[PDB]
Design a protein around this motif. Structure first.
Motif, PDB file in Angstrom:
ATOM      1  N   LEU A   1      -6.700  -0.596   0.263  1.00 12.35           N
ATOM      2  CA  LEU A   1      -5.381  -1.001   0.730  1.00 12.35           C
ATOM      3  C   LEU A   1      -4.839  -0.181   1.913  1.00 12.35           C
ATOM      4  O   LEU A   1      -4.916   1.035   1.901  1.00 12.35           O
ATOM      5  CB  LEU A   1      -4.395  -0.810  -0.410  1.00 12.35           C
ATOM      6  CG  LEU A   1      -4.816  -1.576  -1.666  1.00 12.35           C
ATOM      7  CD1 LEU A   1      -3.948  -1.127  -2.839  1.00 12.35           C
ATOM      8  CD2 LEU A   1      -4.688  -3.088  -1.475  1.00 12.35           C
ATOM      9  N   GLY A   2      -4.217  -0.851   2.882  1.00 11.55           N
ATOM     10  CA  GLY A   2      -3.321  -0.174   3.808  1.00 11.55           C
ATOM     11  C   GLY A   2      -4.199   0.429   4.866  1.00 11.55           C
ATOM     12  O   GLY A   2      -5.217  -0.147   5.210  1.00 11.55           O
ATOM     13  N   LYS A   3      -3.859   1.625   5.315  1.00 15.35           N
ATOM     14  CA  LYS A   3      -4.585   2.275   6.379  1.00 15.35           C
ATOM     15  C   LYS A   3      -4.076   3.700   6.557  1.00 15.35           C
ATOM     16  O   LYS A   3      -3.055   4.092   5.950  1.00 15.35           O
ATOM     17  CB  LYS A   3      -4.377   1.486   7.697  1.00 15.35           C
ATOM     18  CG  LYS A   3      -2.932   1.571   8.238  1.00 15.35           C
ATOM     19  CD  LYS A   3      -2.632   0.589   9.390  1.00 15.35           C
ATOM     20  CE  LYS A   3      -3.214   1.021  10.738  1.00 15.35           C
ATOM     21  NZ  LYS A   3      -2.582   2.268  11.260  1.00 15.35           N
TER      22      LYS A   3
ATOM     23  N   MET B   1     -10.300   5.881  -6.258  1.00 16.82           N
ATOM     24  CA  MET B   1     -10.415   5.883  -4.779  1.00 16.82           C
ATOM     25  C   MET B   1     -10.560   4.484  -4.194  1.00 16.82           C
ATOM     26  O   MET B   1     -10.312   4.280  -3.026  1.00 16.82           O
ATOM     27  CB  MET B   1     -11.590   6.712  -4.341  1.00 16.82           C
ATOM     28  CG  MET B   1     -11.367   7.393  -3.028  1.00 16.82           C
ATOM     29  SD  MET B   1     -10.178   8.732  -3.277  1.00 16.82           S
ATOM     30  CE  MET B   1     -11.263   9.869  -4.106  1.00 16.82           C
TER      31      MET B   1
ATOM     32  N   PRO C   1      -4.307  16.391  -2.292  1.00 16.90           N
ATOM     33  CA  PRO C   1      -5.599  16.849  -1.778  1.00 16.90           C
ATOM     34  C   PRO C   1      -5.734  16.762  -0.277  1.00 16.90           C
ATOM     35  O   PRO C   1      -5.035  15.999   0.340  1.00 16.90           O
ATOM     36  CB  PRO C   1      -6.600  15.891  -2.436  1.00 16.90           C
ATOM     37  CG  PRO C   1      -5.826  14.641  -2.644  1.00 16.90           C
ATOM     38  CD  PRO C   1      -4.414  15.091  -2.982  1.00 16.90           C
TER      39      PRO C   1
ATOM     40  N   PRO D   1       0.785  -1.249   0.000  1.00 13.65           N
ATOM     41  CA  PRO D   1       0.000   0.000   0.000  1.00 13.65           C
ATOM     42  C   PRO D   1       0.815   1.296   0.000  1.00 13.65           C
ATOM     43  O   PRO D   1       0.469   2.173  -0.767  1.00 13.65           O
ATOM     44  CB  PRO D   1      -0.890  -0.129   1.241  1.00 13.65           C
ATOM     45  CG  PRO D   1      -0.883  -1.661   1.575  1.00 13.65           C
ATOM     46  CD  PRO D   1       0.401  -2.182   1.074  1.00 13.65           C
TER      47      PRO D   1
ATOM     48  N   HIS E   1      -8.159   2.803  -1.740  1.00  8.20           N
ATOM     49  CA  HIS E   1      -8.264   2.827  -0.291  1.00  8.20           C
ATOM     50  C   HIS E   1      -8.785   1.529   0.323  1.00  8.20           C
ATOM     51  O   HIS E   1      -8.990   1.473   1.526  1.00  8.20           O
ATOM     52  CB  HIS E   1      -9.119   3.992   0.189  1.00  8.20           C
ATOM     53  CG  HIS E   1      -8.380   5.269   0.156  1.00  8.20           C
ATOM     54  ND1 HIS E   1      -8.976   6.477   0.351  1.00  8.20           N
ATOM     55  CD2 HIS E   1      -7.066   5.517  -0.078  1.00  8.20           C
ATOM     56  CE1 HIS E   1      -8.062   7.440   0.242  1.00  8.20           C
ATOM     57  NE2 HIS E   1      -6.902   6.874  -0.013  1.00  8.20           N
TER      58      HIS E   1
ATOM     59  N   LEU F   1     -12.395   8.484   5.388  1.00  7.77           N
ATOM     60  CA  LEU F   1     -12.143   9.909   5.435  1.00  7.77           C
ATOM     61  C   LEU F   1     -13.411  10.649   5.020  1.00  7.77           C
ATOM     62  O   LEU F   1     -14.272  10.078   4.388  1.00  7.77           O
ATOM     63  CB  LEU F   1     -10.992  10.290   4.536  1.00  7.77           C
ATOM     64  CG  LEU F   1      -9.675   9.571   4.774  1.00  7.77           C
ATOM     65  CD1 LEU F   1      -8.748   9.809   3.596  1.00  7.77           C
ATOM     66  CD2 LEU F   1      -9.026  10.052   6.075  1.00  7.77           C
TER      67      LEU F   1
ATOM     68  N   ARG G   1       0.659   4.262  -2.717  1.00  5.71           N
ATOM     69  CA  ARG G   1       0.515   5.666  -2.324  1.00  5.71           C
ATOM     70  C   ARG G   1       1.610   6.508  -2.948  1.00  5.71           C
ATOM     71  O   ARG G   1       1.370   7.618  -3.437  1.00  5.71           O
ATOM     72  CB  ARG G   1       0.601   5.880  -0.823  1.00  5.71           C
ATOM     73  CG  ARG G   1      -0.231   7.090  -0.386  1.00  5.71           C
ATOM     74  CD  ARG G   1      -0.045   7.561   1.057  1.00  5.71           C
ATOM     75  NE  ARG G   1      -1.022   8.650   1.293  1.00  5.71           N
ATOM     76  CZ  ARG G   1      -0.775   9.795   1.917  1.00  5.71           C
ATOM     77  NH1 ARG G   1       0.432  10.013   2.411  1.00  5.71           N
ATOM     78  NH2 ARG G   1      -1.743  10.727   2.048  1.00  5.71           N
TER      79      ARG G   1
ATOM     80  N   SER H   1      -0.951  11.529   9.161  1.00  3.80           N
ATOM     81  CA  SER H   1      -1.994  12.318   8.502  1.00  3.80           C
ATOM     82  C   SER H   1      -3.094  12.898   9.417  1.00  3.80           C
ATOM     83  O   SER H   1      -3.879  13.722   8.952  1.00  3.80           O
ATOM     84  CB  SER H   1      -2.650  11.473   7.405  1.00  3.80           C
ATOM     85  OG  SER H   1      -3.243  10.317   8.007  1.00  3.80           O
TER      86      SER H   1
HETATM   87  C1  HEM Z   1      -9.256  12.382  -1.987  1.00  2.08           C
HETATM   88  C2  HEM Z   1      -8.070  12.056  -2.310  1.00  2.08           C
HETATM   89  C3  HEM Z   1      -7.252  11.193  -1.374  1.00  2.08           C
HETATM   90  C4  HEM Z   1      -7.048  11.429  -0.125  1.00  2.08           C
HETATM   91  C5  HEM Z   1      -7.587  12.585   0.646  1.00  2.08           C
HETATM   92  C6  HEM Z   1      -6.227  10.475   0.408  1.00  2.08           C
HETATM   93  C7  HEM Z   1      -5.844  10.510   1.688  1.00  2.08           C
HETATM   94  C8  HEM Z   1      -5.158   9.545   2.238  1.00  2.08           C
HETATM   95  C9  HEM Z   1      -4.639   9.479   3.499  1.00  2.08           C
HETATM   96  C10 HEM Z   1      -4.720  10.486   4.584  1.00  2.08           C
HETATM   97  C11 HEM Z   1      -4.049   8.359   3.630  1.00  2.08           C
HETATM   98  C12 HEM Z   1      -3.401   7.863   4.889  1.00  2.08           C
HETATM   99  C13 HEM Z   1      -1.956   8.187   5.071  1.00  2.08           C
HETATM  100  C14 HEM Z   1      -1.464   7.782   6.395  1.00  2.08           C
HETATM  101  O1  HEM Z   1      -1.552   8.609   7.250  1.00  2.08           O
HETATM  102  O2  HEM Z   1      -0.949   6.685   6.636  1.00  2.08           O
HETATM  103  C15 HEM Z   1      -4.216   7.693   2.438  1.00  2.08           C
HETATM  104  C16 HEM Z   1      -3.719   6.508   2.168  1.00  2.08           C
HETATM  105  C17 HEM Z   1      -3.676   5.912   1.022  1.00  2.08           C
HETATM  106  N1  HEM Z   1      -4.038   6.402  -0.167  1.00  2.08           N
HETATM  107 FE1  HEM Z   1      -5.332   8.005  -0.372  1.00  2.08          FE
HETATM  108  N2  HEM Z   1      -5.927   9.608  -0.541  1.00  2.08           N
HETATM  109  C18 HEM Z   1      -6.536  10.031  -1.657  1.00  2.08           C
HETATM  110  C19 HEM Z   1      -6.496   9.451  -2.841  1.00  2.08           C
HETATM  111  C20 HEM Z   1      -5.843   8.323  -3.086  1.00  2.08           C
HETATM  112  C21 HEM Z   1      -5.666   7.762  -4.335  1.00  2.08           C
HETATM  113  C22 HEM Z   1      -6.216   8.311  -5.621  1.00  2.08           C
HETATM  114  C23 HEM Z   1      -4.965   6.697  -4.227  1.00  2.08           C
HETATM  115  C24 HEM Z   1      -4.643   5.746  -5.371  1.00  2.08           C
HETATM  116  C25 HEM Z   1      -3.532   5.793  -6.025  1.00  2.08           C
HETATM  117  C26 HEM Z   1      -4.688   6.579  -2.888  1.00  2.08           C
HETATM  118  C27 HEM Z   1      -4.061   5.573  -2.358  1.00  2.08           C
HETATM  119  C28 HEM Z   1      -3.813   5.477  -1.082  1.00  2.08           C
HETATM  120  C29 HEM Z   1      -3.271   4.365  -0.510  1.00  2.08           C
HETATM  121  C30 HEM Z   1      -2.817   3.082  -1.145  1.00  2.08           C
HETATM  122  C31 HEM Z   1      -3.131   4.664   0.909  1.00  2.08           C
HETATM  123  C32 HEM Z   1      -2.579   3.711   1.938  1.00  2.08           C
HETATM  124  C33 HEM Z   1      -1.151   4.043   2.257  1.00  2.08           C
HETATM  125  C34 HEM Z   1      -0.716   3.268   3.427  1.00  2.08           C
HETATM  126  O3  HEM Z   1      -1.427   2.396   3.735  1.00  2.08           O
HETATM  127  O4  HEM Z   1       0.287   3.479   4.021  1.00  2.08           O
HETATM  128  N3  HEM Z   1      -5.221   7.567  -2.206  1.00  2.08           N
HETATM  129  N4  HEM Z   1      -4.870   8.445   1.594  1.00  2.08           N
END
Ligand code: HEM
Length: 293
Positions: free
Chosen positions: A176-178, A171, A144, A43, A174, A231, A47, A184
């Motif tokens: 995946l992961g956390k 979206m 964003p 994940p 999401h 979120l 990201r 954040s």
């Molecule tokens: C509205 C737009 C998005 C927002 C606000 C957003 C916000 C977030 C936030 C806050 C996290 C958590 C980070 C953390 O603190 O560990 C997260 C995780 C993640 N985002 Fe989004 N994200 C957005 C869009 C996307 C998109 C488009 C993808 C796809 C490529 C994506 C993929 C991920 C993934 C895979 C994680 C997990 C990362 C981890 O698990 O460590 N996100 N996102």
């Protein structure tokens, strides 16, 4: 006036070379499996592919995956990028082994690799991103915020030339992961199987009993009795009638979600890049499982 960024295949390389890198990344993902409580690095790699691509601006063609500028401190230290250093250090040893690959191609390939190894769809991938100098790094603030509503999400993604379907499909990652409080200001996973790529995000959104609560960082998030969270930007997908129609679609058709994610995610990684007519076709890498490795 907009820059042109033309893809240049790193010298003499072909499909077998990039498949070797994919395999190095895939093998490390399988071995370095204890990260983040046994979620693994899948994940955070996805990201990182997204954050390095998602600074793109269609208006002047700045940012995007091409230049691999996350490697510079301005971008590396963007508060929006907090946590992604773990994905960077995971990739560092791969880059030392394969020093010929550009940073753009490595950050983006790591995302493709992770999705496929987590049983997601095949994502065609194209090589050719070229490292650009430090002065081309985008300013912070282009990624964003999470505490906004559907109108903000829609408007945000227009900058990336993404439409309603593309945004909803994207979206789904999401699943995946956390979220991590210290990264954040949000905490908790979106679901149970958080290192397998499925349409679970859309299912939980529709089926869970969501309650608006405040977390230890004083931010509001939606929580369910199952221990999941969303979120505000996630949850706005079921508040907006256009988004909601597509959420229901992907909730009820796994295959469609997979095909739509693949297309949208490839486009995300290729925004801003001009490929010559004589550029190679997109590569489709075999997973370790398909290679019997
Ligand atoms: C509205 C737009 C998005 C927002 C606000 C957003 C916000 C977030 C936030 C806050 C996290 C958590 C980070 C953390 O603190 O560990 C997260 C995780 C993640 N985002 Fe989004 N994200 C957005 C869009 C996307 C998109 C488009 C993808 C796809 C490529 C994506 C993929 C991920 C993934 C895979 C994680 C997990 C990362 C981890 O698990 O460590 N996100 N996102």
């Amino acid at each position: 006036t907009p820059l042109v960024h033309v893809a240049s295949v790193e010298k003499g390389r072909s499909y077998e070379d990039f498949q070797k890198v994919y395999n190095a990344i895939a093998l490390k993902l399988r071995e370095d499996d204890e990260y983040d409580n046994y979620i693994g690095y899948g994940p955070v790699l996805v990201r990182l592919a997204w954050h390095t691509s998602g600074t793109w601006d269609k208006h002047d063609n700045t940012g995007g995956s091409y230049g691999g500028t996350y490697r510079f401190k301005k971008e590396f230290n963007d508060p929006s990028n907090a946590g992604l250093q773990n994905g960077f250090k995971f990739l560092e040893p791969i880059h030392k082994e394969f020093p010929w690959i550009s940073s753009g191609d490595l950050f983006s390939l790591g995302g493709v690799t992770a999705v496929q190894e987590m049983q997601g769809p095949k994502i065609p991938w194209r090589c050719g991103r070229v490292d650009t100098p430090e002065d081309t790094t985008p300013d912070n603030g282009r990624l964003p915020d999470a505490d906004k509503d559907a109108d903000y999400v829609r408007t945000f993604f227009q900058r990336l030339n993404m439409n309603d379907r593309e945004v909803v499909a994207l979206m789904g990652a999401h699943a995946l992961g956390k979220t991590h409080l210290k990264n954040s200001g949000y905490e908790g996973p979106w679901g149970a199987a958080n290192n397998v790529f499925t349409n679970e995000f859309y299912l939980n959104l529709l089926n869970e009993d969501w309650k608006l609560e405040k977390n230890d960082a004083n931010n509001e998030q939606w929580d369910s009795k199952s221990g999941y969270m969303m979120l505000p930007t996630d949850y706005s997908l079921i508040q907006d009638p256009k988004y909601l129609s597509i959420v229901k679609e992907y909730a009820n058709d796994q295959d469609k979600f997979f095909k739509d994610f693949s297309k949208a995610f490839e486009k995300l990684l290729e925004n801003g890049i001009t490929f010559p007519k004589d550029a190679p076709s997109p590569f489709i890498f075999k997973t370790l499982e398909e290679q019997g490795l």
